[PDB]
Design an enzyme around this catalytic site. Sequence first.
Site, mmCIF file in Angstrom:
data_model
loop_
_atom_site.group_PDB
_atom_site.id
_atom_site.type_symbol
_atom_site.label_atom_id
_atom_site.label_comp_id
_atom_site.label_asym_id
_atom_site.label_seq_id
_atom_site.Cartn_x
_atom_site.Cartn_y
_atom_site.Cartn_z
ATOM 1 N N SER A 7 0.823 -1.207 0.000
ATOM 2 C CA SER A 7 0.000 0.000 0.000
ATOM 3 C C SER A 7 0.862 1.263 0.000
ATOM 4 C CB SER A 7 -1.048 0.003 1.133
ATOM 5 O OG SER A 7 -0.491 -0.005 2.422
ATOM 6 N N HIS A 52 -1.894 -8.802 1.451
ATOM 7 C CA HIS A 52 -1.606 -7.572 2.205
ATOM 8 C C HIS A 52 -2.682 -7.178 3.214
ATOM 9 C CE1 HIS A 52 0.052 -3.869 3.420
ATOM 10 N NE2 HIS A 52 -0.181 -3.106 2.367
ATOM 11 N N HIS A 86 7.631 -13.734 13.550
ATOM 12 C CA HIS A 86 8.255 -12.632 12.800
ATOM 13 C C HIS A 86 9.758 -12.891 12.597
ATOM 14 C CE1 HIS A 86 8.785 -8.717 11.036
ATOM 15 N NE2 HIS A 86 7.573 -8.317 11.379
ATOM 16 N N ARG A 120 1.856 -2.637 19.104
ATOM 17 C CA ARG A 120 0.488 -2.439 18.587
ATOM 18 C C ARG A 120 -0.461 -3.544 19.059
ATOM 19 N NH1 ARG A 120 1.337 -2.117 12.352
ATOM 20 N NH2 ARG A 120 2.530 -3.962 13.007
ATOM 21 N N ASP A 137 -2.376 -7.832 14.080
ATOM 22 C CA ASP A 137 -3.515 -8.518 13.467
ATOM 23 C C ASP A 137 -4.057 -9.693 14.274
ATOM 24 O OD1 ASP A 137 -3.828 -6.938 10.910
ATOM 25 O OD2 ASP A 137 -1.722 -7.564 10.697
#
Lengths: 434, 434
Positions: B242, B272, B318, B327, B373
């Site tokens: 994006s 994405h 990750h 986050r 997420d």
Amino acid sequence: STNLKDILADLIPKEQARIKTFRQQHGKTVVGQITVDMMYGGMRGMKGLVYETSVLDPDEGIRFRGFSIPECQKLLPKAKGGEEPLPEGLFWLLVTGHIPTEEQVSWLSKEWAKRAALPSHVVTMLDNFPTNLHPMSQLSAAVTALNSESNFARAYAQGISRTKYWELIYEDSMDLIAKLPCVAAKIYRNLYREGSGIGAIDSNLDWSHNFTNMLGYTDHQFTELTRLYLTIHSDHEGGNVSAHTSHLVGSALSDPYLSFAAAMNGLAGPLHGLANQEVLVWLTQLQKEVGKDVSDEKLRDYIWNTLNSGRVVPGYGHAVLRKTDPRYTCQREFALKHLPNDPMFKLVAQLYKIVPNVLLEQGKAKNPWPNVDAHSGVLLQYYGMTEMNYYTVLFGVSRALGVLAQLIWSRALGFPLERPKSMSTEGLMKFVDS
Amino acid sequence: STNLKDILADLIPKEQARIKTFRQQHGKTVVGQITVDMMYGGMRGMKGLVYETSVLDPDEGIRFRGFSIPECQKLLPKAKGGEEPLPEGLFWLLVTGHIPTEEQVSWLSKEWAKRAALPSHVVTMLDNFPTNLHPMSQLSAAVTALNSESNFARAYAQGISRTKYWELIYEDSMDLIAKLPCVAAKIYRNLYREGSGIGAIDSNLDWSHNFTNMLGYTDHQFTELTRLYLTIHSDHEGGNVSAHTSHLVGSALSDPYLSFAAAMNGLAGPLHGLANQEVLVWLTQLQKEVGKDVSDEKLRDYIWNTLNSGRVVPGYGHAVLRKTDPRYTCQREFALKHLPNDPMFKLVAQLYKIVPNVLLEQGKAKNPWPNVDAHSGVLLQYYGMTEMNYYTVLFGVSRALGVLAQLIWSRALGFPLERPKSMSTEGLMKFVDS
């Protein structure tokens, strides 16, 4: 055979096996360096992606799966009673690597006729756009709205195998190519012919001819100009903004509609999609300044004065290509046989006589020859296609053929998400010490 | 002062002078190698662009102009009677590099209220979209149609100085941010509240609060969740699809509307923009399989069986970041104080207890902690925002703040057209010999 999907299915595992063994051996082979200047400078000169459908040859111009433009003019099939190469055939060439037969082009023509439909919500949307909205915006917004008819999107949501993605990408790409003339003609008539209708598809006509009919044009030679135009503007490597944007968005598994529309927002940018228009504006001004009967000496004076003033001649100059763009030459030959006495063409031709010798004599321009955009406007203008904002929409409809041929291949070969690494100025200054 | 444009104007020549001297010295300094595998592999690990607004710190998470998320939570101003950081303030931070005062955030709130208007053709277009059209498609198509209100586009066509481009890019970017809640709420209600109206802007409210009102939500804690959400999803380097898509399209001098819409077609791609939704689908399935009263042992068994089956736990793992995503942590703390007894949150929390210890014990995942997420869906669901297709639209409205902060800077610093070089397989095999 006459089924492009079957041929495509046969070629894929072979290219997969070619790439597999290539990357085994040379995967860690280094092809370039990245500098700080390249990061600040838009990746200029960084080899960054694999794009299979076309390659720029410094000595012969753009090549379509190895074939130069002169070769494509001679080998690509024509319409009955025509002499310009059909876009259908160009598309076959980019997908397969092979020059198609007459029987294959005709089949492809019938397929695109079969698939050409707009849902009522896109028709309504197009008719309600204001005159105030640029035609490139209309084009992108309507193609984005057509993703409601994407069968790749719907199938992915239900779950399908990575190895089968190319199948529905091919289907969606064929449907989109089929519909583009309808969408583009609709825009033209809503903006420039008071909302009159585009009429119907004739299933026995080729893509270009259905497009000129829908636009409301009648001249056979305009239809012939459109065939040539759409074939030659179809692809020019992956590095340009429209190709790379389709590639990048495609890499996230966004369907052909979403990918192509994003590409058109890129093409709409003045540094990518305005070269035709800029040349034409400049020729029109030139003609006023200097007159229609201009002597070779007086034009030479004006060119020299332009360059001595430190301005440039639009549509002339190139860092890499060492001869006149074949795509320019294709249009020159068209002009010489169909509008040799047009005053704007005579000016274009006079510029071809004089400018390049001046540029070699100044000795700055690495290569002093003209590109495609130096010649395209005067030809459109001659046949009454004078709405210059619309010129970029034609380029778009052409460029669909190249970017969607690649997109099918990107998914067939399993190309992953495009995700380079970015750095802040502050970060890149710290990375410099190490 | 309370004028963001004035501050911005003062900072630009200084960053120009910093970059000028940096490139003088280190312009030809090499920062990496390009391999054949990197070309086939989506530029993975190639440093390719300069993106100033954010940087990923392997030890602390994403940083916003140097500030970590914990720092932004404490320092960014809040609403009266709130405790979550306002997106207005995040935007100020990304444009200036400075934490704003209360007086600056309030001014920015009033500016976005002032600019928030839709022309009647966009309203009509949105109301005529079918239920069949995905909300991300609606969002992109409507933003593309709003380029009819781009003053950068119109000014460029008339002729303006390269050095002044950032000015109207800033103006167009501010107008777009202002309108996004209107466009997004309109989509929500047309799809999920039977076409009911979004009501009016209140000029004394902040961006988030006007958005929840327009959506038809009433709970103060939902408005507080939205402030947090929009602040934390705002930016994450330039490499993601994006950001890079906005950057690339922007580089052709396409205006903020065209750039952002292209970016949304990228965000719409399943690789994405679907991570939130995928976690939620998987949690819902898990809850059915294993039950609501699940023992720590039984859940551990199910996680182990999942991994032994060779599947993955979504929202966990990750390659780079070495701790839990701040986050994620921000959302966990929200949950603990506002919905600690929600059964889906308890499951999320139980997963946080058990999964990471299992992953360290398996010893494969480079880093076994959850990302943003893993936590976002259960919070949206708790407040009745259950339309999972719509989740990516919220991410979009957030991500506008980061990509448009950068876009202003790209034009202020004169970043050129993004144009890497592509190669065919056949070409790259020949280049290998040299």
